[PDB]
RNA sequence: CCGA
């Protein structure tokens, strides 16, 4: 069998269970898991593993980075007090320096932990998925950042410091109004969750699988799910539990799968390395007495095959989607109170030199929510770093339509200098209008 | 158990006249409250095979409902299995659990067939397994199988395949993560970062090429044949592997 | 305070007083402020008490700047708050300071130390927590506090507290008496063993002997979860943070048999039984020793009149009152009156009606007073005679009771182990509880391991700190140089120097009793103050299996009051509708309620071993139609066989 | 109302007691059964046993008198001496 | 736990999952009044007999 | 292999300490012989306490007697600390009277033979001017921790048997030109004073023995 | 609007606006021929899915 | 006071023995106390025979490979490691191996004196080719712990003294009519096939009653 | 009002 020469967490625990559940079944797969808790809970006794005060390891560079931060924001309020900049790109700047000194920090605690003590206990509970994310472990060790208003207002001033040295009163009252914004939340918008799931279950408590064919030709057309660049969910997640409506060829022209041929993992993935656009069967496509068939649903889910005749697949449907909601706002308070942003890509040069100039591009000027004016790109075209290397100094940074550039055309690049940044989703920046 | 007499109440009393103990209902209503050691054989003899669902409020999903084969504990409290929590969303800080028995055969068919807790190990909102360790078992064998350079006792020894290695951690000879080499002639081996490429090559006597990896050591013959290979591995990892071994193919 | 508020639909709207507010006589609440002068804080007489009069005009820093002592503010910058806005201004434009930096937070939350290094849910939690403490039997000072213990104790009221110059001529466990000297005898009683509103113990013991000076304000007696003059909650135990075989798993709890067998977390609880002889129609209840049904040696404890004696132990189902009234109706079945007829059992005009204990709440009977209106009292009207009787019980600690710190810190006993296998320590002295660490960076309460590093250092040394929380005004690092220099100097200790290693720390070597193996990695180890909860398991279980109904649904009631059954919400429907269990769900809602034939049928086939039959139309399904009908709709049934519409008869 | 283990409990001495009387002689189980109405729901009097019969009911009182001896005998009667409250 | 296994196989060889649970019933309450008599055993219930006869016919 | 006594230090009679050193073992069986003396030595060893209290006036346990600063209870709490040594395993009786005011201390107990109590200068109760204490106590044997049976006039007291309260080992080496090399385990016994180490240290060996005896002989 | 637009006034009745719907059904004169898992519930039967499903 | 019952006893046919042993009743604690130290010596002290040096005629030096064999000389030393057997002698003996190919070599091939004996006949050792023969002679000892030679005459080899592979134990609880809470103490013995399983259980008794006896005085 |  399979030796797995390597370090195991929860996620490959997690591989190995649901490869289990494939050739093995039910009871094996849980006798596998009750013998994979035992040894757990015996070699973690045996370990030992405990967190004092002096596991919690603050980074050294802290110091500099939170004077680097302040000095952005000295030179920001520098700017608006000259006129050149108003204040609601003031304030955006503001925000923005203040998460990214944040996820800064996060990321110099995460090296700072492989590189001195990998086997520490924070370390080793954050990592393996045991318990923690590395919000906890930023919050623990680097510093909180800014919080949330109970409506979702971003309040205006820092906490730089964690909770290993201590907050001060300034600083414990600002967490207080995150704290607030937890338990107000978790106390009122439960209902809407609820709510919401007891329409979901009444709009579709009648869809019950009562056909095996409703022989229909009509189909769904199956993507990868993107938003901008990098995918979200891939083609070979996407046709998971589906049945097939039209054949997958290959390049060769040897037949992949026929239709109404059931996909599971290995011919899904057989599928997804060779074309992007699939057709499958879908309970929009079927037509069947305001109902669903056994060939337009596919698989059921928690057993692993095809469904069952009297299936309550409405039930099961209005669950799924009503769960994780209400989960998930009565757990909002384990972060705290603190606010959540995606911060924008930024592909910067690593030393002197300049910048090709794009060829099959156009641009326009467009002014930047932080103030600086900036050309945004029309037509995607590649770039390139222009090094001052003799043998070999060159990076190419190849553009998303929608892009922003801080670069004229064959401009003189410093040491360090801003050079490019894609914009944030519609969903990913999360932004209303206010006066 | 004196949550069991009251819920299993009227199946005792079919026992205690099935077995010739009493003769009517209020003889056997007199023995269950007054306290017999014959009614907790009784108890113990009627709850075996007889299914028991478990609720936690608030039943968000499918899960939050499930059937147990119960077993009389001493106490006030119920002993619910670790591995279940995530599906029930309930830790050990307060939570209570309602308790309903089912009184038809129909009903108790239904319960082992369709809703045993050993059966629903994967989710139906994904194919995802709901059923996986987690919070101790993770960090458990996350410790099992990491790497520890100070913990380096008899690193670098020969062993005679994966018994072998386990007889010398049970006997002290070798660290939990000491790295070892491993006689183990199979070759469905995955590791971080997998490597097959060849980083050098030592040439013997007789025809016979060493060929050396990052984690594996393969000598083959000149043209048809493989005759040996090692493994550098920890103990812990060996440990892990033979958890699987004995836990699946049985 | 920002912190302490209610968890549920309350959030928000119910608040709590901070420590120095106050209320003037217009009814708006002021805080004391120190005053300012040249970047100097004041601090010659009272302060100013500004009611609300700081937003538009002064400038108010908190009261943890840093500042040299008979000195001006130090730093450049202070920060302040100015217009309901915070800022940073000279310290010589500063109006006001505050006066401690405890002003932000109440009482329950300046309970806590170490509180800035704590979440804010953490110490919302660690205060409600504080706040649902039981008083043990021997209450224990913190080894850390903070030092409004004594103040809380003093305010509470339940202290004795003296008020003259005197001597103590006279103590005893039931009355201090102490002439004044600076009509000539203070008389000070002494509560012995009260019921509270949640059935608590309210005990008062003598701290002072005879013969000596006593000063205006002393504490001459301590309460129930008061010793020493302050407040006692808990008890100081033995930590490790580390994990057991999967007993303290999901913030599950681990303790050893010290903890049960040295009278550790025992406390004592007082319940109160009251039964009134009322006037029937049919003739007066009468309270009586004479009870029918009833054998002989369940009458051991009954006096003359058919009333427990005082000194009594009781179980589950002994009498404590007995109880009959006169029935007068006499329908019997043909069965009854056959079995009359043979045996000859001429049946009574009185049936049973008392006072029994409920399932469980065993104890000893402590009052037995009895209320007669012929005796001088005058009763509720319709009542004859009211009998009051309280039962007392010494609850020891048990597996499924609640456990917690001051940090937000919970969790349940799921396993006492005994000391020669609980982990223990290189001197050889056993764990007392070992607590998950995982528990600690999820939930953000890192200031628990400074108090149990602390409280250990303490423990080694003798001294019982107090620490007053936003400690880091006085340096970087402040509460952590002061824990492991505590240590260190706890390490000095002539034969105790395995108390302190530094190449680790806050961790020492820890030993398994089962193997005498060590761990194989060092250990956190220390002194925590724990809580024992009012949520204990004796009254969390309960169980059905067939009791009352309601009046129309004739549903079985809720409650554990009345042997009330669970309620099968909709979201279970919908979880038994996703399975499949189309008879689990039929039978959950015909034969386990509201439909009397197929509940007498179900019970009956499964007392006598046979098939449970098929269920009719549920009691509330003809009730809706009946209101249906009432509202005016005509609503029908109707069956369709063989070319023929008929309407059908659900009432049957 | 009446709960369900009070119906089932007389339910369960109806059985045991038809079982028990019809043991005995066939005429005396049916006097002792329209005695007390275990089969008309009407319990009747001493004379309209005599109208059933013909025969008049001073022997009806002497057929009771000895079931009720019979039933009352202490060995083979003990089944029905456990509902005894 | 062999009762967990044979569970398993006749989940996973019917054809539907909702109706092998019915004959598993009608199977154990057959079995249930073919031994109405007290002579029996507490281990073996008629519902796991039947899930056990099946499985063995099931092969 | 010898035993050898070290160090010997004595409380009042509370706290009766010993080291004792035994060499030479093998590498593991020092562990061995230490972690199975140390179990034995703190859950299977018989000693004798206080089961039951009888106060003349007193019913139950949340009771006052007038002149006593101390309640029932606390009174219970006091007797459940005394420190005894009972000769025979028979259930014995103790006697008290006492007349305030003074300190009551365990000098003042009327024993009988076979009972002999071990510290005198143990705090009972204060009493006051015009007070009177007459109690009588029960005293048993037995192992570990006993719970309360389902409860004349004897109020019962959750007695604990342990007269050894702590023990602790370390393993030491013995390193030369002596190849394959042996350990030394020292031993540190704590008892309360109704046991001495060397007695408590004999009964430990011989039931170690005895548990061990039959598997080598029945196989 | 689609969960009060169904064929059936019971369920319709139990989710939501139990006045307009009843209101609606009593003038319209419709039936309600027990076709889903919320009418059996109330009405007492086994449900149209799962092991009830024939 | 208590009765110890053998529940299962099982042989594999490559000569290794297995057996579940049961005692009942224990106080509470006693079980973990005698299932750990019969644990411990059951592992560490119990003497066994294992092969301490080979010698093979016709090698350069300790790493290398031999002609006209397949096994090299490591994992010619790595399979007589797996060698189990039993010697009656504390002074050492030699064992004599010569064969010729083709085909494969057993233990039966051995010509070792009757002091030692050899448990597993069919255990594998090499496999031969084209009519190449081997000769080699090896050295038997007994013992107890484990030798390992630096660096990899007489060729000196790894050396392990073990009769017993595995022991595992479980404690049950048993409550009963009484208030004592009685131990149930599950003991399971793996063996090398050299001894029994019940036999390695009196030896480890005898070792621990051997050690506490002189302390009662 | 509190607990999950
Ligand atoms: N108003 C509420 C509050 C709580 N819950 C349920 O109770 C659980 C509360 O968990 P609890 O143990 O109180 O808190 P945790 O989330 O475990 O966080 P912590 O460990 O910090 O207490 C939630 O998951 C939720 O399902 C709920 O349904 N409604
Ligand atoms: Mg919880
Ligand atoms: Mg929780
Ligand atoms: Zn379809």
Not at chain 3, 54 to 61: C, G, L
């Amino acid at each position: 069998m399979t030796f797995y020469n390597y370090t195991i967490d929860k996620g490959r625990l997690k591989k190995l269970i649901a490869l289990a559940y494939r050739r093995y079944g039910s009871a094996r797969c849980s006798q596998l898991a009750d013998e994979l808790k035992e040894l757990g809970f015996r070699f973690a006794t045996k370990a030992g593993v405990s967190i004092s005060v002096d596991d919690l390891t603050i980074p050294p560079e802290k110091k500099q980075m939170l004077e680097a931060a302040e000095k952005e924001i000295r030179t920001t309020e520098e700017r608006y007090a000259r006129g050149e900049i108003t204040e609601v790109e003031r304030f955006q700047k503001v925000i923005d320096t203040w998460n990214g000194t944040s996820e800064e920090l996060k990321d110099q605690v995460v090296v700072n932990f492989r590189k001195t003590d990998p086997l520490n206990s924070v370390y080793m509970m954050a990592f393996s998925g045991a318990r923690g994310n590395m919000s906890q472990v930023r919050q623990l060790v680097g510093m909180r950042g800014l919080m949330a208003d109970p409506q979702g207002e971003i309040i205006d001033l820092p906490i730089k410091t964690n909770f290993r040295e201590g907050l001060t009163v300034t600083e414990y009252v600002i967490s207080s109004y995150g704290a607030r914004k937890g338990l107000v939340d978790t106390a009122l918008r439960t209902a809407d969750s609820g709510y919401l799931t007891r329409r979901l279950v009444d709009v579709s408590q009648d869809v019950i699988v009562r056909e095996q064919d409703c022989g229909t030709e009509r189909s769904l057309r199956v993507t990868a799910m993107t938003d901008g660049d990098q995918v979200k969910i891939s083609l070979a997640d996407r046709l998971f539990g589906r049945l097939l409506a039209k054949d997958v060829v290959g390049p060769d022209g040897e037949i992949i799968a026929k239709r109404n041929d059931e996909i599971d993992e290995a011919l899904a993935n057989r599928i997804a390395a060779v074309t992007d656009e699939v057709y499958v069967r879908s309970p929009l496509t079927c037509e069947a007495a305001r109902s669903v068939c056994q060939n337009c649903y596919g698989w059921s889910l928690a057993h692993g095959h095809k469904v069952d005749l009297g299936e309550a697949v409405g039930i099961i449907a209005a669950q799924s989607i009503g769960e994780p909601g209400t989960q998930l706002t009565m757990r909002t308070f384990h972060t705290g109170g603190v606010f959540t942003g995606e911060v924008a890509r930024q592909e910067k040069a690593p030393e002197d030199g300049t910048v090709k100039w794009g060829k099959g591009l156009s641009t326009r000027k467009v002014r930047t929510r932080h103030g600086e004016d900036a050309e945004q790109v029309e037509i995607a075209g590649d770039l390139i770093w222009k090094g001052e290397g003799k043998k070999a100094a060159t990076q190419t940074y190849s553009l998303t339509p929608g892009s922003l550039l801080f670069v004229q055309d064959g401009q003189t690049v410093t040491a360090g200098q801003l050079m490019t940044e894609i914009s944030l989703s519609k969903t990913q920046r999360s932004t209303e209008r206010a006066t | 158990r004196e949550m069991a007499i009251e819920l299993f109440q009227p199946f005792v009393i079919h026992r205690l006249i099935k077995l010739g103990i009493v003769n009517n209902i209020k003889a056997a209503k007199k023995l269950i409250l007054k306290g017999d050691p014959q009614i907790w054989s009784v108890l113990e003899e009627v709850i075996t095979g007889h299914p028991v669902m478990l609720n936690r409020a608030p039943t968000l999903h499918r899960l939050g409902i499930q059937a147990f084969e119960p077993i009389l504990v001493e106490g006030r409290a119920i002993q619910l299995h670790p591995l279940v929590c995530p599906a029930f969303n309930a830790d050990f800080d307060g939570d209570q659990m309602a308790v309903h028995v089912p009184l038809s055969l129909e009903a108790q068919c239904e319960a082992r067939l369709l809703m045993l807790a050993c059966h629903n190990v994967l989710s139906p909102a994904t194919g995802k397994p709901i059923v996986a360790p987690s919070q101790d078992m993770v960090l458990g064998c996350y410790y099992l199988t990491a790497e520890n350079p100070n913990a380096q006792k008899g690193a670098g020894r020969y062993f005679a395949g994966i018994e072998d290695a386990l007889r010398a951690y049970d006997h002290g000879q070798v660290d939990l993560h000491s790295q070892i080499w491993i006689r183990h002639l199979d070759e469905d081996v995955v590791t971080e970062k997998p490597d097959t490429e060849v980083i050098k090559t030592e040439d013997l006597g007789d025809g016979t090429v060493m060929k050396y990896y990052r984690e594996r050591k393969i000598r083959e013959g000149v043209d048809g044949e493989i005759i040996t290979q090692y493994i550098q591995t920890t103990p812990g990892r060996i440990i892990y592997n033979k958890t699987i071994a004995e836990a699946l193919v049985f | 305070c920002p912190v302490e508020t209610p968890e549920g639909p309350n959030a928000g709207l119910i608040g709590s007083l901070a420590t120095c507010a106050r209320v003037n006589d217009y009814g708006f609440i002021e805080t004391p402020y120190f005053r300012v002068e040249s970047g100097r804080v004041r601090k010659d007489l009272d302060p100013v008490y500004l009611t609300a009069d700081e937003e538009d005009d002064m400038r108010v820093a908190p009261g943890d700047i840093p500042t040299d002592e008979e000195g001006n503010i130090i730093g450049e910058s202070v920060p302040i708050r100015y217009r309901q806005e915070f800022s940073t201004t000279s310290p010589e434009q500063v109006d006001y300071v505050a006066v401690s930096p405890v002003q932000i937070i109440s009482v329950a939350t300046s309970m806590i130390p170490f509180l800035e290094h704590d979440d804010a849910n953490r110490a919302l939690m660690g205060s409600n927590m504080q706040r649902q403490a039981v008083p043990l039997l021997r209450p224990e000072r913190p080894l850390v506090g903070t030092g409004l213990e004594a103040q809380a104790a003093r305010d509470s009221g339940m202290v004795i507290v003296s008020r003259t110059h005197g001597i103590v001529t006279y103590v005893d466990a039931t009355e201090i008496r102490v002439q004044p000297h600076s009509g000539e005898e203070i008389v000070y009683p002494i509560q012995k063993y009260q019921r509270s509103n949640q059935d608590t113990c309210l005990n008062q013991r003598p701290l002072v002997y005879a013969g000596e000076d006593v000063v205006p304000g002393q504490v001459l007696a301590d309460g129930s979860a008061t010793e020493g003059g302050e407040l006692a909650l808990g008890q100081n135990i033995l930590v490790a943070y580390m994990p057991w075989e999967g007993y303290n798993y999901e913030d599950a709890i681990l303790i050893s048999e010290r903890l049960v067998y040295d009278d550790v977390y025992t406390s004592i609880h007082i319940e109160k039984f009251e039964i009134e002889a009322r006037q029937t129609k049919l003739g007066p209840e009468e309270i009586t020793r004479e009870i029918p049904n009833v054998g002989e040696d369940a009458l051991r404890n009954l006096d003359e009149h058919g009333i427990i004696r005082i000194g009594a132990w009781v179980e589950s189902g002994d009498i404590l009152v007995g109880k009959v009234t006169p029935k007068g109706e006499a329908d019997q079945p043909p069965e009854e009156k056959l079995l009359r007829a043979i045996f000859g059992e001429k049946a009574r005009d009185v049936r049973d009606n008392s006072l029994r204990v409920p399932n469980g709440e065993k104890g000893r009977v402590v009052d037995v007073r009895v209320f007669t209106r012929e005796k001088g009292d005058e009763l509720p009207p319709g009542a004859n005679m009211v009998v009051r009787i309280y039962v007392a019980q010494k609850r020891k600690i048990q597996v499924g009771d609640k456990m917690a710190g001051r940090h937000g810190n919970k969790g349940i006993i799921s396993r006492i182990l005994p000391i020669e296998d609980m982990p223990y320590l290189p001197d050889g002295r056993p764990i007392d509880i070992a607590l998950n660490p995982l528990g600690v960076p999820s939930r953000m309460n890192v200031g628990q391991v400074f108090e149990c590093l602390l409280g250990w250092a303490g423990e080694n040394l003798g001294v019982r700190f107090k620490i007053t929380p936003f400690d880091e005004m006085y340096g970087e690092e402040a509460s952590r140089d002061t824990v492991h220099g505590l240590l260190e100097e706890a390490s000095q200790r002539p034969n105790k120097d395995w108390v302190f290693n530094e190449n680790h720390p806050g961790k020492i070597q820890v030993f398994d009793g089962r193997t005498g193996e060590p761990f194989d990695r060092p250990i956190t180890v220390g002194q925590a103050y724990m809580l024992k909860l009012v949520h204990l398991v004796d009254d969390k279980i309960h169980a059905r299996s067939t009791g009352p109904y309601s009046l129309v649904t004739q549903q079985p009631l809720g409650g554990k009051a009345q042997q009330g059954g669970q309620r099968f919400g909709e979201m279970e429907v919908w979880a038994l509708e996703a399975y499949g269990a189309a008879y689990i769900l039929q039978e959950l809602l015909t034969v386990k309620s509201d439909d009397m034939q197929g509940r007498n049928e179900a019970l009956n086939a499964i007392v006598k071993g046979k098939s449970i039959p098929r269920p009719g139309t549920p009691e509330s399904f003809k009730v809706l139609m009946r209101e249906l009908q009432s509202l005016g709709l005509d609503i029908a049934a109707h069956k369709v066989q063989l070319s023929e519409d008929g309407e059908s008869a659900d009432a049957e | 109302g009446e709960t369900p283990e009070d119906e089932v409990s007389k339910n369960l001495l109806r059985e045991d007691l038809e079982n028990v009387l019809d043991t005995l002689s066939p005429r005396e189980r049916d006097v002792l059964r329209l005695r007390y109405g275990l089969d008309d729901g009407r319990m009747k009097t001493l004379e309209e046993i005599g109208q059933i019969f013909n025969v008049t009911r001073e022997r009806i009182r002497q057929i009771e008198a000895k079931a009720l001896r019979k039933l009352r005998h202490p060995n083979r009667n003990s089944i029905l001496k456990e509902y005894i409250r | 736990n062999h009762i967990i296994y044979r569970s398993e196989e006749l989940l996973g060889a019917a054809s539907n999952r909702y109706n092998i649970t019915v004959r598993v019933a009608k199977r154990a309450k057959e079995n249930r009044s073919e031994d109405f008599d007290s002579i029996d055993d507490p281990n073996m219930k008629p519902a796991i007999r039947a899930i056990i006869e099946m499985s063995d016919e099931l092969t | 292999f010898q035993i050898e006594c070290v160090e010997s230090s004595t409380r009042k009679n509370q706290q009766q300490y010993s080291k004792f050193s035994l060499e030479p073992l093998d590498r593991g069986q020092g562990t061995t012989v230490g972690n199975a003396l140390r179990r034995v030595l703190l859950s299977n060893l018989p000693g004798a306490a206080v089961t039951a209290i009888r106060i003349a006036g007193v019913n139950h346990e949340f009771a006052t007697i007038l002149g006593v600063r101390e309640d029932v209870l606390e009174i219970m709490l006091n007797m459940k600390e005394l420190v005894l040594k009972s000769y025979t395993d028979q259930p014995q009786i103790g006697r008290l009277t006492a007349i305030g005011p003074g300190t009551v201390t365990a000098a003042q107990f009327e024993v009988p033979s076979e009972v002999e109590v071990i510290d005198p200068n143990q705090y009972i109760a204060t009493l006051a001017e015009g007070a009177k204490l007459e109690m009588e106590f029960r005293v048993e044997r037995g192992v570990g921790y006993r719970v309360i049976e389902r409860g004349l006039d004897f109020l019962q007291i959750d007695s604990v048997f342990m007269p050894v309260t702590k023990v602790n080992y370390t393993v030491e080496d013995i390193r030369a030109d002596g190849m394959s090399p042996k350990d030394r385990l020292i031993l540190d016994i704590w008892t309360n004073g109704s046991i001495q180490p060397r007695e408590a240290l004999s009964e430990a060996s011989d039931i170690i023995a005895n548990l061990f005896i039959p598997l080598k002989d029945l196989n | 609007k689609a969960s009060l637009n169904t064929d059936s006034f019971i369920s319709a009745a139990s989710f939501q606006e139990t006045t307009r719907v009843l209101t609606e059904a009593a003038i319209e004169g419709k039936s309600d021929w027990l076709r889903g898992l919320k009418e059996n519930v109330i009405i007492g039967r086994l449900i149209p899915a799962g092991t009830g499903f024939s």
